[PDB]
Amino acid sequence: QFNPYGDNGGTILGIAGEDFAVLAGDTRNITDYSINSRYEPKVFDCGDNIVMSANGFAADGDALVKRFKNSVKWYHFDHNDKKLSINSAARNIQHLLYGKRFFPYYVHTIIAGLDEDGKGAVYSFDPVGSYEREQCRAGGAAASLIMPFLDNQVNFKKPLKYLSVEEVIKLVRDSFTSATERHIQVGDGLEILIVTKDGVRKEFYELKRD
Amino acid sequence: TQQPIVTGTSVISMKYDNGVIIAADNLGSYGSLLRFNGVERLIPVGDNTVVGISGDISDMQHIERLLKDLVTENAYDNPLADAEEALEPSYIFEYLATVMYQRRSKMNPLWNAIIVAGVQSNGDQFLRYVNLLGVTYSSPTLATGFGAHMANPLLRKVVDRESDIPKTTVQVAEEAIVNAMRVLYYRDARSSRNFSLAIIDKNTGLTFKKNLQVENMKWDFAK
Amino acid sequence: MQAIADSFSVLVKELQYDNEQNLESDFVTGASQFQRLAPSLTVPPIASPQQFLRAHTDDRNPDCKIKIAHGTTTLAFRFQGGIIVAVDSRATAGNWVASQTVKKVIEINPFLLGTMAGGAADCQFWETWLGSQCRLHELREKERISVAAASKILSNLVYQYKGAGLSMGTMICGYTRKEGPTIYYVDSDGTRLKGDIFCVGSGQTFAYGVLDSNYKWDLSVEDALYLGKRSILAAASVNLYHVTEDGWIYHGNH
Amino acid sequence: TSIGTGYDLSNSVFSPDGRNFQVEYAVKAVENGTTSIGIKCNDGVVFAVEKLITSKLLVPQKNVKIQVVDRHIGCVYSGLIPDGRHLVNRGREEAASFKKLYKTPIPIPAFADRLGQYVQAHTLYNSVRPFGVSTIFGGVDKNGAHLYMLEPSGSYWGYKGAATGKGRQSAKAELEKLVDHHPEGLSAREAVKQAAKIIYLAHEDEKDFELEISWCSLSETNGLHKFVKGDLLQEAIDFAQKEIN
Amino acid sequence: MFRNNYDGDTVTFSPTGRLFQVEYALEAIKQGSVTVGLRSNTHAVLVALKRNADELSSYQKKIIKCDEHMGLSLAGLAPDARVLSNYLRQQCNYSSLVFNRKLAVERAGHLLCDKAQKNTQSYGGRPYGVGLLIIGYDKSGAHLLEFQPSGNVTELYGTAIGARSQGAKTYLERTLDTFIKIDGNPDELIKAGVEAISQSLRDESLTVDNLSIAIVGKDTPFTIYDGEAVAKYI
Amino acid sequence: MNIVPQDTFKSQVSTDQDKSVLSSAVPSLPDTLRQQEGGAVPLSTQLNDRHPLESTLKNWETTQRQRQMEQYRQIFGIAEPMKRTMEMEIVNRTDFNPLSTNGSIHRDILLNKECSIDWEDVYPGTMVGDDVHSKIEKQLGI
Amino acid sequence: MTDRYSFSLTTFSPSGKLGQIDYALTAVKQGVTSLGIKATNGVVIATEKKSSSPLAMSETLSKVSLLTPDIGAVYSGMGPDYRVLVDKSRKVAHTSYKRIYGEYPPTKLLVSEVAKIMQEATQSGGVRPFGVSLLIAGHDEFNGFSLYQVDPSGSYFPWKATAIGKGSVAAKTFLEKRWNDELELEDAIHIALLTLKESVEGEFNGDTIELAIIGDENPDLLGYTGIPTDKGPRFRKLTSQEINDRLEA
Amino acid sequence: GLSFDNYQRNNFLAENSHTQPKATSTTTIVGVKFNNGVVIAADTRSTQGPIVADKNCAKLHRISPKIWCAGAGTAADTEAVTQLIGSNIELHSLYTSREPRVVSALQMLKQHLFKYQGHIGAYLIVAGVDPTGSHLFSIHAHGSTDVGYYLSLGSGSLAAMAVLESHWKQDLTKEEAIKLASDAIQAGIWNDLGSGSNVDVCVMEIGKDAEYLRNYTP
Amino acid sequence: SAAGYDRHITIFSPEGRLYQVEYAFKATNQTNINSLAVRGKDCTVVISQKKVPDKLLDPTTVSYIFCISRTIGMVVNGPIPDARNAALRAKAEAAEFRYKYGYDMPCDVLAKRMANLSQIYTQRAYMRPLGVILTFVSVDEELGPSIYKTDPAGYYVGYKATATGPKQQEITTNLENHFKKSKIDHINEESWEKVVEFAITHMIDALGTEFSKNDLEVGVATKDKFFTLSAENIEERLVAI
């Protein structure tokens, strides 16, 4: 019996601010105990100030991102180049994921952007389609090493609402450095995309594997 | 299919300051039997693309047929096929990755590992890897099979990161590739002594070398 | 004859793009994939799709596993003039921070409610689909859809895929003018029951006993809400929903 | 009688004399098209087309009347432009399929047979229409040089020299005179000059025109199909002008 | 009288050898307004004069964006224009999705010709009755194509189609070398196009409501100017 | 160029895949009453536990016909398969016999089965449907 | 879509008559004469072998064909329709009966199948009715010998003696006065020869007329021996030599 | 064609409480070719498992009056396939107005057996004569055919093959061929428990009617 | 001329006739060329008349004789497009018969198959008959030399000898007179070259005014192979009377 699935590791993290969103991921693609690539981005700018990242089976994530981008292009064609909201994108991704209910994608999905009011918004998707809006979400085989760090160094009830973008970037960098120290899979780089009303900004940091 | 029957072993590729270099040995093994000698596993597509395929030989020939069909259809009906309307390596890799993923989703995959190497029109090097599951990735050095475990560290010692690409001349990359092929012939049972090499350079074009043999063998440390 | 000539004229075959479904699903010819009232579900092209799915759904990333709605206690009863639906808001530990309470109850319409008690994705997707179907029916007939009709539609839908791998058990509660207040239970095995009192979850025998102790038709809104809250507490942060002919009203703890 | 009433409003219908009038109407439509000729020399073929002058807004290098089907096949047509384009596309597909399957350039007789079968298949049903084009094509294969002409009825023949269009009669007379004057053989360059002369003679009706010539010969083009450079084209034009007056 | 007996459909020839239905489809182009297209070595532009039903109505959209590097303007029937624009969008989307390759202007013209020819030889489908002007920018530079619904495509430096379009064509022919050598100055080319289309006006003046412009270039993606965006060119 | 049929499995499923038999009250769901299959036959049961030879036998002459058409295209050109398919389609479309299922003589002549017998010929094998009007609607597409 | 249907070729006239069927009958009446005579020991089927060209080999074309080892047929009308119908009848005799009941069909059932096939062409959208008339002679265990005539409309009737073709009326008049319940197979053959003698305008010998008989079994024609229960074929086509011998006598 | 209905029901019954009734599985079959024809012989004893069911079984099947065959394996499958091919052969001979050939029957049988991918359990020995001569072939249930001079099949095929290897030569007469086939069947009867009783013989010679003999030994 | 319908499709006229079939039959004589087929002792010879009015036409590309298979040859009377269509269909049918039944296709079976196809064309309303007459010649392994002719009406028949064309009556009468004189249904010659010479002489004395090597086309079928003669072979046969 041919096995159509696989695993490529990787860790992603999405945080929602008061007027911005952050989506970061480690840029290392690895097979079982071997490094395929030391720089392979997993977070993409999927159109109208929306960042998307599917972690797990790389081929499934690439296919899902490609399908979503084509759907966004046809959405712009159909409705006078109307801007696609984050909740509509979330429902589109839910339908895309559930369309393969009996042959599921082996990915966990996180998207980030700004809602209608202007606050940061992060949506999390299980492989079959179920989604919900969260303030912070960590996916991959480092979440148990990243979430307690964030809970210790910040409160979601220093409240998260008063944080600036630089403080969030610093917290993400520190958590990923700690995970890199503790976890073998995590390392070799960290790419962060910040979504604000001005657009999407990209930053890169080198982790402890070169 | 369910498993390869006649199989190739490894393809190794590296980036240097002006282009890319790829190499693969000429052998088709029938299980533990080294059956066919003289199997070309590097396919030159266009004047600037080289595709290296490792794995099932029948699927490799099928992919060769697909590449030839693509090249023939490109000239239909472009009168500038040799001109700026040629096939970029990105187009070929996108088509091949789409085919591999579609066949994987159909439960009838092509048991191959494919490395596409070349130089774009603007002069940017292109080097990508795809497999039977449709997993695609890029790196300054790429390899398949036992090359991914033995030749990869040797190549990464030369081109460690993206900043080291402009510092690597073609001579250094070619020497490293030859040494990696020698190591593979040393420590791979299904490997072969004869191999082919391809250099794609934005100035000198495509250089294809055949009937290259592993030399400088060290066996005297026995008795 | 032109189509026949083109069929025998020569890449697309390997891409499988000569088929309409592949082009539609990849959004090549337009956004017609997102325009199907009845969604199309991908099935592996093998002789044993069900066994394949069952084998691959029990194998090990915690994030890449199908989320299952927790077996929390859910209660529903119709006393005199509405339906009380009571759930317990006891969140589960995870690697995330929630901006609001977990939505353990699906709001089908301003007049219909449902419970998950199964797979989260299946319940959400198919209850949204049921809401769309009910909206279309109400537009066509110019009248609110009966709760029996909605429950029957959902039951037929889940029966068409019986044995494929779906796992969902829902309680459709609704108050119509012709029928009054009605509660149906629809299971993924095609089961469809009509009842006055429903209790489900990890612990529901205690809640059912508490209800049977102090249940009567001649209750009031406040008495019914207190009874539901007491039953949920005894079965153990109690979310309440009161459904009347004008729709459903939500109470966090009152 | 060239107008058969009661037997000319549908495609696949026999007249009481046993004639298909839709095919004859297609031939009449062909006869009003531009004049194109082809000459078969000793080791190749030469194609000549009279091109009507048009607006200066057209890109000179993106509007060529002589179509190339394969590297060793040249083709011209007279009649309806869409039908000619459709037939050229079918011929390119056939040549590509043959080369892919049998790993050799398709022989001219086999290509002609496939094209003729495709054309004739459109005269069997009342839901289609006969091709309103007559096609003169040719090339070089292992057997030598071949030149063929194909009609709307699906009937094709090999010719020493072929001509179609408005000025077909004068061109045919000139071709017959050339054949009589060269019973042993004709060279490629002499064929080009004679094609230019015939094209210039065929324009007896007011309107300025240009000339397009194309070669396909082993000695000159190494078996491929090429157009004419500036020097040879200018020489042919000057020779034609000298012959005119 | 004799023409009346042989114009039933596209599978019938006249005794003189004429296909009258395709000719009628070609004649249907004149019922639309005038559109002009013109290109230089760096940019290609389209100018359209839109029409409204009455005072209370809106104006027709005569310029349609097909891809970030290719667009077209219409003259003739609405249904066939909609169908052909959707077909071109689908072709561009397929090319980008499968090859990550921008569809060439010549390839789009060839695909349109192949699609349009098949309706002029079969039974049950009328020929298309819309002329199209397609501008694009690809690896071969700037391109302008004129598509005639008989199944014909011509490559030219400038042209105009629609009702009373002969004046614009004559103006473009006369001032050819003047507008050809306009590189890196899109405004000059747009002004030349507006001046060319002004020759086809009859008891009408170009306003912000009935004027539409489209432009594509080396670093300029296909952009459409409507309303106040064209007020500077009036 | 296939000898044994391939790709006989479904890739997608839906509740409205059978366009002929759909409910009118809920057009997105099938009509169980007019299916007349037994009343307890979900579509999913058709995706599992099938005889391996059933697919091979059900589509066998079609595979040979397709291989023959491919050979004709490779050797003769497009015209030969085009003409064969055109003739077969004309013969199939002209015939309409709601009271019989046996094929026409001309179809067998075109298929070259004038003097050939298989188990399909020997074995050619309600409250609702199976009448003339249903077949008329199916044929005309109304 | 207008391509999903085709209007019926055969339609009722205002007088209530299907024009295509009547025209098919007219075409039948212009064909060569064939006849059949039923006797107590067998049935004789006879016809005239027309020949447009004298260089044609008369034995290559046979207007009398073996349907089953006990059932034969002759036609009047269009030859290609006869050939197609004979092939179809031979196929149906095996698909419908022998592969089911393990035995060959009776004469009446085979005639009914042929008539149904012929009728299906008169209510169609693109095939004209068959322009042939059929005389089928057979034998079965439970009904003895039988002779049937099948019209282009698909109607079949049993006959004691009948004739179709150009001279059908004269042949029927002759056979009305030369038939009785005590007739024998040899007498029937002689009467058929006499009736055909009055219809052939040209040369009348064994190479211009064709005859066949349904009589007793012919075990020498089976091709194998050893099974007593395997009855030999009863249909036998008379050779030209036998026809010449009977003409001389 | 053949129905696949009640397949799942039969599997459920087999897996839960019921046993499917068995099918008769047919026993020596031999074919010997002599200078002017062929002889096909078979044993006449059929046993239902360990119990003898009949002492006179006709296992010789007829395809054409001069083309015969004997089959082993599933008896129903053998009979049905032979009858279908015989009907096809009769129709083809009527269509061509010519004597049927052994190669045509071989081709039909091979293609039909390859269609069902071995699910039809019929292993055949087909002998016959035609205008081209005398022919003898062996056909496997998966659709593979072989050509030979003497062939044996069935449970007692090894003893029959030993006898054939002992006493076969190129130049043989009709009586010698019949005796050799009878001896092979007798050896299969005596040295194996799957064969017994009498022998059915069919002799086909060039230019003569086929001769069928039942109970040749008495 | 048909009154109402029958100008388009093949249905019965009030007289009970198919006018389209008759018009297709009339269309077969447009080429104004004649063909003659005769049988030898162990061979069959077909001879056709070549006309090249246009001096620009290449004579080598003009032919109406086709090689259907190794043993069967075909001669077509009528327009060349339908001729080539029928030739390709005959090739396909013969190859399919060989694949399906395991032995070579006889001439009469192929003629009957083409006749059945013609019957399909004559009965279907949306199909038209091919205006050609086909003559298959071979040497069957069970019947010796064989000639079979099929017409657009769906009728096929074998001939001892035959001739078709605008002047077929003269050749047919001459052949009938020769057969009556010699009292043999074939030619008593052991070599195909003599049969070819006899057929050439018969054609010469039937049509008249003789002809040269460029005005003839000869095909010979033996028990092994069917082949078509070239200009040199025809000229050498012409030399020998």
Curated annotation (Swiss-Prot), chain C:
Entry keywords, A to Z? Cytoplasm, Hydrolase, Nucleus, Protease, Proteasome, Threonine protease, Zymogen
Q: Give the residues the record marks as binding bortezomib.
A: A120
Propeptide per record: which residue ranges?
1-71
**Quick one: where is this thing mainly located?**
cytoplasm
> Catalytic center at which residues?
T72
What start and end residues bound the annotated signal peptide?
none
Which Gene3D superfamilies does this entry report, sorted A to Z?
A: Glutamine Phosphoribosylpyrophosphate, subunit 1, domain 1
Which top-level group of life is the source organism from?
A: Eukaryota
- CDD domains in the record, alphabetically? proteasome_beta_type_5
Q: How does it assemble?
A: The 26S proteasome consists of a 20S proteasome core and two 19S regulatory subunits. The 20S proteasome core is composed of 28 subunits that are arranged in four stacked rings, resulting in a barrel-shaped structure. The two end rings are each formed by seven alpha subunits, and the two central rings are each formed by seven beta subunits. The catalytic chamber with the active sites is on the inside of the barrel.
**Note in the entry:** The side chain of Thr-72 acts as a nucleophile, and the N-terminal amino group acts as a proton acceptor. Present with 8530 molecules/cell in log phase SD medium.
Instruction: State the protein's name.
Output: Proteasome subunit beta type-5
Question: Which species is this record about?
Answer: Saccharomyces cerevisiae (strain ATCC 204508 / S288c) (Baker's yeast)
Gene of this entry: PRE2
From Swiss-Prot, chain E:
Keywords attached to this entry: Cytoplasm, Isopeptide bond, Nucleus, Phosphoprotein, Proteasome, Ubl conjugation
Q: Which organism is it from?
A: Saccharomyces cerevisiae (strain ATCC 204508 / S288c) (Baker's yeast)
Instruction: Write down which residues bear the modification named Phosphoserine.
Output: S14
* Other noteworthy facts: Present with 7210 molecules/cell in log phase SD medium.
Recorded protein name is: Proteasome subunit alpha type-6
Q: What family name appears in the similarity comment?
A: Belongs to the peptidase T1A family.
Q: Which domain of life is it from?
A: Eukaryota
SMART domains per UniProt: Proteasome_A_N (SM00948)
**Function text:** The proteasome degrades poly-ubiquitinated proteins in the cytoplasm and in the nucleus. It is essential for the regulated turnover of proteins and for the removal of misfolded proteins. The proteasome is a multicatalytic proteinase complex that is characterized by its ability to cleave peptides with Arg, Phe, Tyr, Leu, and Glu adjacent to the leaving group at neutral or slightly basic pH. It has an ATP-dependent proteolytic activity.
The Gene Ontology CC terms held by the record are: nucleus; proteasome complex; proteasome core complex, alpha-subunit complex; proteasome storage granule
User: InterPro entries per the record?
Assistant: Ntn_hydrolases_N, Proteasome_alpha, Proteasome_alpha-type, Proteasome_asu_N, Proteasome_sua/b
Q: Where in the cell is it found?
A: Cytoplasm; Nucleus
Q: Where is this cross-link: Glycyl lysine isopeptide (Lys-Gly) (interchain with G-Cter in ubiquitin)?
A: K191
Q: Which residues form a coiled coil?
A: none
Task: State any GO BP term from the record.
Answer: proteasome-mediated ubiquitin-dependent protein catabolic process
Swiss-Prot record, chain G:
Its localization reads: Cytoplasm; Nucleus
Q: Name one GO cellular component term.
A: nucleus
Any Pfam family from its record, for instance, is: Proteasome_A_N
Record-level GO BP terms: proteasomal ubiquitin-independent protein catabolic process; proteasome-mediated ubiquitin-dependent protein catabolic process
- Mainly localized where? cytoplasm
- Domain of life (superkingdom): Eukaryota
Q: Where is this cross-link: Glycyl lysine isopeptide (Lys-Gly) (interchain with G-Cter in ubiquitin)?
A: K108
InterPro entries listed in its UniProt record: Ntn_hydrolases_N (IPR029055), Proteasome_alpha (IPR050115), Proteasome_alpha-type (IPR023332), Proteasome_asu_N (IPR000426), Proteasome_sua/b (IPR001353)
SUPFAM superfamilies assigned to the protein according to its UniProt record, in alphabetical order = N-terminal nucleophile aminohydrolases (Ntn hydrolases)
Q: Which UniProt keywords apply?
A: Cytoplasm, Isopeptide bond, Nucleus, Proteasome, Ubl conjugation
State the protein's purpose: The proteasome degrades poly-ubiquitinated proteins in the cytoplasm and in the nucleus. It is essential for the regulated turnover of proteins and for the removal of misfolded proteins. The proteasome is a multicatalytic proteinase complex that is characterized by its ability to cleave peptides with Arg, Phe, Tyr, Leu, and Glu adjacent to the leaving group at neutral or slightly basic pH. It has an ATP-dependent proteolytic activity.
Stated family = Belongs to the peptidase T1A family.
Please tell me what else the database record remarks about this protein: Present with 7060 molecules/cell in log phase SD medium.
Specify the protein name: Proteasome subunit alpha type-2
- Organism of origin: Saccharomyces cerevisiae (strain ATCC 204508 / S288c)
Lineage, uppermost ranks: Eukaryota, Fungi, Dikarya, Ascomycota, Saccharomycotina
Q: Which gene encodes it?
A: PRE8
UniProtKB/Swiss-Prot annotation, chain H:
Say which domain of life the source belongs to.
Eukaryota
GO biological-process terms attached to the record: proteasomal ubiquitin-independent protein catabolic process; proteasome-mediated ubiquitin-dependent protein catabolic process
The alphabetical list of record keywords is: Cytoplasm, Hydrolase, Nucleus, Protease, Proteasome, Threonine protease, Zymogen
Q: Which GO terms describe its molecular function?
A: endopeptidase activity; threonine-type endopeptidase activity
Q: Which reaction does it catalyse?
A: Cleavage of peptide bonds with very broad specificity
Active-site residues from the entry: T27
Its Gene Ontology cellular component terms are:
cytosol; nucleus; proteasome complex; proteasome core complex, beta-subunit complex; proteasome storage granule
Q: What class of enzyme is it?
A: hydrolase
What compartments host this protein?
Cytoplasm; Nucleus
**Which protein family is it in?**
Belongs to the peptidase T1B family.
The subunit structure is: The 26S proteasome consists of a 20S proteasome core and two 19S regulatory subunits. The 20S proteasome core is composed of 28 subunits that are arranged in four stacked rings, resulting in a barrel-shaped structure. The two end rings are each formed by seven alpha subunits, and the two central rings are each formed by seven beta subunits. The catalytic chamber with the active sites is on the inside of the barrel.
Q: What else is on record for this protein? A: The side chain of Thr-27 acts as a nucleophile, and the N-terminal amino group acts as a proton acceptor.
- What is the recorded name of this protein? Proteasome subunit beta type-2
Organism name: Saccharomyces cerevisiae (strain ATCC 204508 / S288c) (Baker's yeast)
